[PDB]
Amino acid sequence: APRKNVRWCTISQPEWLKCHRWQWRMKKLGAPSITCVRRAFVLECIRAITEKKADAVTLDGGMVFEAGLDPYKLRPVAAEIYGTKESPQTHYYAVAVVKKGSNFQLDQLQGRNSCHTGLGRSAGWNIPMGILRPYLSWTESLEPLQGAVAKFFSASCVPCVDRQAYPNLCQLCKGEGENQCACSPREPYFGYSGAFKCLQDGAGDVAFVKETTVFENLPEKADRDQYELLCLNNTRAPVDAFKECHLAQVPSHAVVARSVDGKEDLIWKLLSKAQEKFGKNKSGSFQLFGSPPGQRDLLFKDSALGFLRIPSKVDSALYLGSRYLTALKNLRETAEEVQARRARVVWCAVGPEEQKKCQQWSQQSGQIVTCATASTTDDCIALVLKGEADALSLDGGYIYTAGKCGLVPVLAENRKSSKHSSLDCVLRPTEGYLAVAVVKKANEGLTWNSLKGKKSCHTAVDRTAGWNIPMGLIANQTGSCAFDEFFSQSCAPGADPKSRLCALCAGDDQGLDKCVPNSKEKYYGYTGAFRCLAEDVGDVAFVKNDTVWENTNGESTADWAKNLNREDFRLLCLDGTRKPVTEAQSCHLAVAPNHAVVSLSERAAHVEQVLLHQQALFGENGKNCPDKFCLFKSETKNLLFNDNTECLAKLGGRPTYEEYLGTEYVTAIANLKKCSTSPLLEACAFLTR
Ligand SMILES: [Fe+3]
Ligand SMILES: [Fe+3]
Question: Are strands 645-649 and 489-491 parallel, antiparallel or unpaired?
């Protein structure tokens, strides 16, 4: 069928034929009958695909990133697998291959002839240029990179460049006719091997290629031993020592398809069956991962064992990884712009209201703190993986996801204490907060033991006291993963907007975005949960202790908590009794870890540095708080930080999420999690890799 076939996109007659030989072998196996388009630019292929004129193609990391941009947004469908049948790996190393007997190092590269695989590609041009930057004498505003690189080398075949402006580059490029220095295998020195031919044929003093490149064009040592490698160590090594002598680790070439309505399924099925029948050493007739003698890397990357499935949730950007993304981005930013992104912290605001507060925070801070905004926490977390943000404050249950993704508790919010007026906040330990089940006193029938079939208000799907504790407890009493079945109706923003759990959620004044895991939805979070129990919409509210005192008895001016009588509420203890919120020192469901500031490791030190500055300006004893901007005061709407917070306190050592949340706790989250995985939870599992 038109969409039961996967039209694969070639970029050269030779590549074009390999596919058709594949079409024949894939037919007798009865599967998505592959279709095969032809073109000449690895870019034009991206166009066709994006233009629904093609389906998929395989691009090197660089390309992937490029392909993933707004003009045409493609997605890494499947990663290629490298290594050996027994030691598979999905990333590679960019290496500086040189000849033996050359008394030159990496810092002595000025004015020499170099060979690059292709423009933009990773190992062949990206990484090398990232390494050399310093010795580039680049005026980002006076000229491009191809500019300074041009004067940096005496001549280097760098296919895809425009010799017009920079000819000493394509100068060394083999092949005649303006056809020379092309961006498709059309150009002999273009590619991985093409870059070797370039150092083999005497054209350069060094070629930038992957680790096994040398090994693929020279099977007999005697031959290989005459090629060395350039360590960043400023020393040389044998091509067998790449693991110790390499420029950098980069992600493997993947195969992309369209972002939406992009035949992801038919492609993947088609990739596994091709792998099985013509994988590395499956048939002699046709070799999928091997290309015929003469040319190389046709279609897929030669000598690649298999394909690892990409979670339909990691975009180009997430795929490529954080560090590599950064190296890549910075290749379009001046040394001035990049040093700005480094020194400023970028909080991630969860919602339109919270984004508004950060904008203000930003402003008052003098622009030391800028804002990036997501529609949900899982989204702000994804964002931190993109280095597009820096940190944000997370609740226990959320830290988990963030912790599982590789983030780290930087500073923890500390509330007011009972003992010390001495030890200063930043230095005192967290006493954690209590989880409670609130209900209106005027409901004497309801007890912990009679909660089923009731309506419920939770802070949010996946929050500590709002969900993880309650469903944790209700779960080990039924062994059931079902939640659409314990409460006749409830409001747990986050969950499937069609389940009994989103029935009681209302949303903004206008009625939109019901059950949205951000303040937008009104019965959202610690306060929206209680507002929910207060308004009689549901029967018991699952929230933290102080939450009750914070909206009862004239503490909050929220026109819905104005008249609330504190005693008018009751806690549901676990015995099966109900107590008054005053004696909740013995009627809570459990102790939870304070929400804390997660962030990226490489930013941990910095973020914790800046926040100690901000907090000082607008916190309890701050200097610019009362009058200019109070960081922790949201008018009982708990934005950015818990109102009831006294300060961002430090934490001994470099604790991990498990060390912070709690193994016992962490396990409980894990188990409950077993009932369901997050698309961002799956992504990070693979990501971690
Ligand atoms: Fe590559
Ligand atoms: Fe919480």
Answer: unpaired
